[PDB]
Write a protein that binds this ligand. Structure first.
Ligand SMILES: *SCCNC(=O)CCNC(=O)[C@H](O)C(C)(C)COP(=O)(O)OP(=O)(O)OC[C@H]1O[C@@H](n2cnc3c(N)ncnc32)[C@H](O)[C@@H]1OP(=O)(O)O
Length: 116
């Protein structure tokens, strides 16, 4: 990965949306936070939705509840994104069903900070 969008990025230091953002930046990744609550996180422009993301994002990492994730994954696929990574707790079989049908690459059960 080079350019990573982070759905559920947060300014709350107790939340994985913040911990992951800081970790990935520390590792030299370009990270684009996505969360309607924030206009910036760590000074970085924060996107309202995945529909606004630049088309050269390599992967979208999800750290939101599965009910939210299903909606966002639909938006991401509609916007042309094809690599969707779900942090443990963000996945569901309904998401799996939609993603297998859409024919996009996805990851369940793998920890992004471990894998990077
Ligand atoms: S793998 C080893 C490390 N472990 C993890 O990374 C564990 C990850 N999983 C979890 O923490 C939980 O299982 C999940 C459900 C993934 C996340 O739990 P949260 O309690 O943190 O979930 P929140 O409801 O607080 O959501 C996280 C942030 O996402 C924001 N959010 C809601 N809806 C959207 C949409 N549509 N788009 C972008 N972001 C969205 C929430 O508002 C929240 O951010 P805050 O601003 O902090 O509220």
């Amino acid at each position: 990965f080079r350019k990573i969008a982070l759905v559920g990025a947060s300014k709350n230091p107790a939340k994985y949306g913040n911990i992951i953002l800081k970790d990935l930046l520390s590792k030299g990744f370009e990270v684009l936070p996505v969360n309607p609550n924030y206009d910036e996180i760590e000074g970085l422009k924060c996107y309202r939705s995945v529909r606004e993301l630049p088309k050269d994002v390599d992967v979208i990492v999800f750290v939101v509840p599965p009910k939210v994730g299903l909606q966002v994954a639909k938006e991401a696929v509609e916007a042309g994104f094809k690599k969707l990574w779900f942090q443990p707790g963000a996945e569901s079989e309904e998401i799996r069903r939609f993603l297998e049908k859409a024919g996009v690459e996805y990851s369940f059960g793998r920890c992004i900070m471990v894998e990077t």
